[PDB]
Design a protein around this nucleic acid. Structure first.
Ligand SMILES: [Mg+2]
Ligand SMILES: [Mg+2]
Ligand SMILES: [Mg+2]
Ligand SMILES: [Mg+2]
Ligand SMILES: [Mg+2]
Ligand SMILES: [Mg+2]
Lengths: 185, 441, 131, 262, 70, 58
RNA sequence: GGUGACCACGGGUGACGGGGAAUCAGGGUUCGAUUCCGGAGAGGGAGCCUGAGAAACGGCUACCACAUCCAAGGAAGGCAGCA
RNA sequence: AAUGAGUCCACUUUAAAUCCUUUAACGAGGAUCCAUUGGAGGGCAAGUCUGGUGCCAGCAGCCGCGGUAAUUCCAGCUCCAA
RNA sequence: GUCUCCGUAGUGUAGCGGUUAUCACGUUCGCCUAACACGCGAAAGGUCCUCGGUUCGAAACCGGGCGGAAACACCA
């Protein structure tokens, strides 16, 4: 019949137990520190790490010199150092199990623009990114969860159309300007 | 193309209204001959052989068995000038509610009174249905009336001429006080069963010369009904105003679902947009438009059309509801409204607490008088005294009306056909008037 | 007009249809997706051809403006263009007309010709009265 | 079903056709021809997804009607003709010639070849038999049959066949130490030399083949197709030389290619 | 009485004044009370509760979101 | 039946109807998380009380 | 003669089979009417013509159950296709 | 100062449209362009606040609350979870 | 739409063209007990579904409409 795809998967897992005072504060620490909207996206990155930990753990139980362990071993190590959460010289499967979620959270675009100084605050960063102001390479990106790679980290900058790089100021500046010239000769 | 109008045939009890219009349909070519030939065999089978012409419109099994018209019958034929729609009314005392539905959704009316000895003297009486039929026609937005003297062959001598002259003056002496004009209305001799002078001049009527009517828009002269039917004035059609549609009837047709049938009086109805019903507050899109089993693209005012709705059950919408476009202002329920009415006849008095039955836009429900706000004179709306106490016959009064049942009406100042209504009790019309102010819900 | 440049890539000639195929990317820095007519006339100037045989379609604007990628069709002759081209593009440029009736009526006409057998007068007269 | 099937769902199409999931629901469904539909390329995909000459199905319809596509020396107007293995797809108007040979990953690859190397074709004899009046016949891996063959050709050998005549120009005997190509299964598309032919009465024979790099693999006899005399292949082998490389070394091949091109 | 199978069951009305919202001979969407055909709380032998009446939710009537179809 | 159903909705009828006071619109989303993160984490209270709860009714 | 406690035979299934889905230490437990493959059916049965291929039903014949038109003499049906 | 959600020009898309992406002119100070659904005795995060009701109404998946000073019902306020 | 029956304290429901009352209740209520239980003491409770017509005045005599219960038909 139809030529659809219906290939979808959930990107997060809810906690087994609700209402732990320890877990609620730990997630709220991260949400406030990294300026996140809700607990789904701290659960999402946690789910991402768990999938990486599960894949890394499976390879570790796999016998050494196994082609699959060798091929997929450097495959996941290659992309972990590409995004930047893993040190260039820390290229061992053991060191992956030591990864946390803070490093996976600071690679976010909202965090990097704040750290780059383009934004005055982590929460300024989210609204700045969402308002189509920042760009990576020559592409404007309006998603805070855009993880950046080591190569793309330097290119992060203001978009040309935004009232921070090129000209063309915002409407409120124009309306204020036209009101000023309309109030006098 | 052809203008769109409506004619209702009304008269006394057992006056042959359905027989006369059945004979008219046959002459004009509405249906063929063999089917009528098949009705006479069936009619002769049960026993009533004189009711064959009326078997065309009296389709109901109980109507034929009991020999009495009970329900409205819609039928189609074509004149030589435009498109004409006819309805059939019971004309009985018990079914007074049923003629009210049809006459509200009726442009022109045709009153017929039998000329036979005994049938006429029963027609003119306190119990006579002809007298309140004319008043109900007047109060339900019918401005054009044709009077027809039926069954001259029954009376003795056949074709007396003087008897025809007498009966028409008797009805004319009643329309004078009703408000109609004898000059504007048309008078014609017809035969329900004999079958004379419908399409061609009758060779048996040398005494008849020709009727004439004078109106502000011109003159007209003729001999049979069709001359009057083609010389009537087409009414105004306020198409620019928001659409309203009272629920005449609802049917469930296999394969297309629910179909509400009713007359359009304002606006234009098409397939495509969404409509809202006031008393039940259901919002649905119109599926299709058909009248007389013929498809349409638009529904001009004055069209008795049957539109199709989707995702609506039969019991959800019932007869008497008003359907309007949701994009324009849709009708709501009215917990109260302010209406002026005169009093026709009442042996007793009116006080706070009396519950008559109000009939408007094919809706018939009993309503209370919350309070008597003010009594005014018979005409021109001139204030006279304050502090109403009791109401009698022959006087007007404003009043606030709070019906318990859900209901929807529109002010006469905006919608003429919707503001026209009747108030009845004791199987007599006791009040006639229009609604000036309404309260939305 | 001041800052609108046309670049081509994946260019290849195929005399299979006597045409040369390419995918073009426009650069409208602060402008809306440039209309196909302007691309047609500029792409013609780049390839030295009259701007009535150039065919372009499939123009998708990237997120944030600037680059828009489209597909380019050029031909050696307008004769060949009428020969092997989809009819919508010919209708888009006005060289082909589809002044027809809706498919629903065509099916009804066909079914109604199925009811009448043989007689050409009624077979061609099946759709006259039920207009 | 009540009769022959004449549809092919897109998902159910062979993998080596390399079709995607979103363009449509159906697949070319190749017509009957010299090759089975699981190991054939319909002309529609070859001129749309291989060479990108045509964009849609009707565009490849026009090119076939104009009669420049010439398979195995004959013009073919069928949009879904089953091309098959080592068949010469000659398009004379463009001057390019293609020999349809599997790549290293068991997929048919675009193999441009010289015009004079398109005048001949290799073929695997499948059944040898004698007809009426004592005339020996020979049927190949294609549905092509010839009469009066050289009596030294046995089953599962290779015959050097030239186009436009249909005669046997030469032949390759099936023997140990002969270069071959695997035409089915996991080892499909691997060029190697016969090392051992073990036989199983009542069942399929298994042959052992060693490639140039020394890797040894086995397959069924029905997936063998000898394309060389000892060591020297008789056809221009495609890029990769029919050598199989594991997941380890194409990765570093990309990195080397990327680094050189970067 | 269930419109299918015509069986008679007792359904609890789970609010403070929603019984007044219930009159005679109406369609009510009854649901299980909570624990799979078992009696809940101090109510003896009642395993069902009413959810909707006259095709309008009992919660909406309780909170005044929408009123009876009068 | 005992016919004791006449008391349905008793207390809810008796309860005096006090209207909700109008209040400032509450920040929602990331800002709501900002408020509660600032409230409970980045703050120092010199007053004692043995870590009383967020809804102290002192 | 053949089959059966290594469960024959019979009965039930809210049983179309499978690829697969949910849950997820490991082992498992449920679910697969549903887009891919295979089967079955076209209201219930039965019987056939043509054709390479049908026991076909957007083919025919008959019966059963429903049901349409009729001038009552007859005639025409199969949405578990899209709406 | 910045912005979209909305109106809305054109382009683009498309068989023709629509939507999306582009891109004009408007478009935010209760930025009233107004986030909800369930809870606050324990399990289980959150009140031993105030006003009503008084084994009644009712709540309560389970323990249990209510018979006049209800941390549990009906409300207000305030907190909690997503 | 046609018709048929029913409708009276909150139920259980007498009634006379001059009176809607009683009754088992149901409740409020003094009556005892911390609270009960148990029993003891009076009440309130009605547009006679609603609107009228007839009558000197009707709940009932009649007519209407409303709702519940019974059927009968209703195809642009
Ligand atoms: Mg089954
Ligand atoms: Mg299945
Ligand atoms: Mg079958
Ligand atoms: Mg054949
Ligand atoms: Mg069959
Ligand atoms: Mg509370």
């Amino acid at each position: 019949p139809v030529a659809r795809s219906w290939v979808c998967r959930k990107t997060y897992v809810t906690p087994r137990r609700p209402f732990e005072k320890s877990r609620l504060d730990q997630e709220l620490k991260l949400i406030g520190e990294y300026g996140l909207r809700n607990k789904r996206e701290v659960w999402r990155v946690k789910f991402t790490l768990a999938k990486i930990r599960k894949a890394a753990r499976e390879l570790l139980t796999l016998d050494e010199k196994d082609p699959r362990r060798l091929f997929e071993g450097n495959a996941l190590l290659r992309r972990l150092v590409r995004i930047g959460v893993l040190d260039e010289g820390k290229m061992k499967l053991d060191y992956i199990l030591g990864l946390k979620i803070e490093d996976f959270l600071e690679r976010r675009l909202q965090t990097q623009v704040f750290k780059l100084g383009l934004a005055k605050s982590i929460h300024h960063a989210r609204v700045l990114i969402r308002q189509r102001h920042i760009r990576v390479r020559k592409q404007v990106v309006n998603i805070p969860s855009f993880i950046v790679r080591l190569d793309s980290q330097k290119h992060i900058d203001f978009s040309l159309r935004s009232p921070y790089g090129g000209g063309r100021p915002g409407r409120v500046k124009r309306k204020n300007a036209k009101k000023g010239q309309g109030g006098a000769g | 193309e052809k203008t769109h109008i409506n004619i209702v045939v009304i008269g006394h009890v057992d006056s042959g209204k359905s027989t006369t219009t059945g004979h008219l349909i046959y002459k004009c070519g509405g249906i063929d001959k063999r089917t009528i030939e098949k009705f006479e065999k069936e009619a002769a089978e049960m026993g009533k052989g004189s009711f064959k012409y009326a078997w065309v419109l009296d389709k109901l099994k109980a109507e034929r068995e009991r020999g009495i018209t009970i329900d409205i019958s819609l039928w189609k034929f074509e004149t030589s000038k435009y498109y004409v729609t006819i309805i059939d009314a019971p004309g009985h005392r018990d079914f007074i509610k049923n003629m009210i539905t049809g006459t509200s959704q009726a442009d022109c009316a045709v009153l017929i009174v039998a000329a036979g000895v005994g049938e006429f003297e029963a027609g003119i009486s306190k119990n006579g249905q002809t007298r309140e039929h004319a008043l109900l026609a007047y109060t339900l937005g019918v401005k054009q009336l044709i009077v027809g003297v039926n069954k001259m062959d029954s009376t003795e001598p056949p074709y007396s001429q003087k008897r025809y002259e007498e009966i028409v003056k008797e009805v004319s002496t009643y329309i004078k006080k009703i408000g109609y004009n004898p000059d504007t209305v048309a008078f014609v001799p017809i035969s329900g069963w004999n079958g004379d002078n419908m399409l061609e001049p009758s060779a048996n009527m040398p005494w008849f010369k020709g009727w004439k009517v004078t109106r502000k828009d011109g003159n007209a002269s003729g001999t049979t009904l069709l001359e009057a039917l083609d010389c009537i004035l087409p009414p105004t059609r306020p198409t620019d105003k928001p659409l309203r549609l009272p629920l005449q009837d609802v049917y469930k047709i296999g394969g297309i679902g629910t179909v509400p049938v009713g007359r359009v009086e304002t606006g234009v109805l098409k397939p495509g947009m969404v409509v809202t019903f006031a008393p039940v507050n259901v919002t649905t899109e119109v599926k299709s438009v058909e009248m007389h089993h013929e498809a349409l693209s638009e529904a001009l005012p004055g069209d008795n059309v049957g539109f199709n709705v989707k995702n609506v059950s039969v019991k959800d919408v019932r007869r008497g509801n008003v359907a309007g476009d949701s994009k324009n202002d849709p009708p709501m329920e009215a917990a109260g409204f302010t209406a002026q009415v005169i009093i026709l006849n009442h042996p007793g008095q009116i006080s706070a607490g009396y519950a008559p039955v109000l009939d408007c836009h094919t809706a018939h429900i009993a309503c209370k008088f919350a309070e008597l706000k003010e009594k005014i004179d018979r005409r021109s709306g001139k204030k006279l005294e304050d502090g109403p106490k009791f109401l009698k016959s022959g006087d007007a009064a404003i009043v606030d009306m709070v019906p318990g049942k859900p209901m929807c009406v529109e002010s006469f100042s905006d919608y003429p056909p919707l503001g026209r209504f009747a108030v009845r009790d004791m199987r007599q019309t006791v009040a006639v008037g229009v609604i000036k102010a309404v309260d939305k819900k | 007009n001041d800052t609108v440049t046309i670049r081509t890539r994946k260019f290849m000639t195929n005399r299979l249809l006597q045409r040369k195929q390419m995918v073009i990317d426009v650069l409208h820095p602060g402008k809306a997706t440039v209309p196909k007519t302007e691309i047609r006339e500029k792409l013609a100037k780049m390839y030295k051809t009259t701007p009535d045989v150039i065919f372009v379609f499939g123009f998708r604007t990237h997120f944030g403006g600037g680059k828009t990628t489209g597909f380019g069709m050029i031909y050696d002759s307008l004769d060949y263009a009428k020969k092997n081209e989809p009819k919508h593009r010919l209708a888009r440029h006005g060289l082909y007309e589809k002044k027809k009736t809706s498919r629903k009526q065509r099916k009804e006409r066909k079914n109604r010709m199925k009811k009448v057998r043989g007689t050409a007068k009624a077979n061609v007269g099946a759709g006259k009265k039920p207009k | 079903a009540r009769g022959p099937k004449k549809h092919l769902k897109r998902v159910a199409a062979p993998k080596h056709w390399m079709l995607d999931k979103l363009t449509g629901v159906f697949a070319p469904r190749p017509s009957t021809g010299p090759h089975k539909l699981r190991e054939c390329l319909p002309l529609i995909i070859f001129l749309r997804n291989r060479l990108k000459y045509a964009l849609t199905g009707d565009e490849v319809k026009k090119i076939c009607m104009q009669r420049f596509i010439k398979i195995d020396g004959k013009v073919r107007t069928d949009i879904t003709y089953p091309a098959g293995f080592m068949d010469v797809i000659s398009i004379d108007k463009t001057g390019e010639n293609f020999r349809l040979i599997y790549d290293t990953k068991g997929r048919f690859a675009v193999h441009r070849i010289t015009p004079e190397e398109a005048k001949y074709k290799l073929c695997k004899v499948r059944k040898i038999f004698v007809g009426t009046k004592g005339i020996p016949h020979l049927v190949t891996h294609d549905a092509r049959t010839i009469r009066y063959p050289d009596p030294l050709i046995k089953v599962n050998d290779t015959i050097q066949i030239d186009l436009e005549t249909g005669k046997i120009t030469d032949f390759i005997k099936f023997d140990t130490g002969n270069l071959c190509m695997v035409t089915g299964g996991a080892n499909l598309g691997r060029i190697g030399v016969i090392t051992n032919r073990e036989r199983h009465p009542g069942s399929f024979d298994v042959v052992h083949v060693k490639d140039a790099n020394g890797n040894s693999f086995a397959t069924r006899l029905s997936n063998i197709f000898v394309i060389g005399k000892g060591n020297k292949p008789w056809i221009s082998l495609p890029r990769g030389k029919g050598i199989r490389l594991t997941i380890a070394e194409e990765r570093d091949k990309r990195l080397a290619a990327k680094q050189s091109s970067g | 009485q269930l419109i299918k199978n015509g069986k008679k069951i007792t359904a609890f009305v789970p609010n403070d004044g929603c019984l007044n919202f219930i009159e005679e001979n109406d369609e009510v969407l009854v649901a299980g009370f909570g624990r799979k055909g078992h009696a809940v709380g101090d109510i003896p032998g009642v395993r069902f509760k009413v959810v909707k009446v006259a095709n309008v939710s009992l919660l909406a009537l309780y909170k005044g979101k929408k009123e009876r179809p009068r | 039946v005992h016919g004791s159903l006449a008391r349905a909705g008793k207390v809810r009828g008796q309860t005096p109807k006090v209207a909700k006071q109008e209040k400032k619109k509450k920040k929602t989303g990331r800002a709501k998380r900002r408020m509660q993160y600032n409230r409970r984490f980045v703050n120092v209270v010199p007053t004692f009380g043995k870590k009383k709860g967020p809804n102290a009714n002192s």
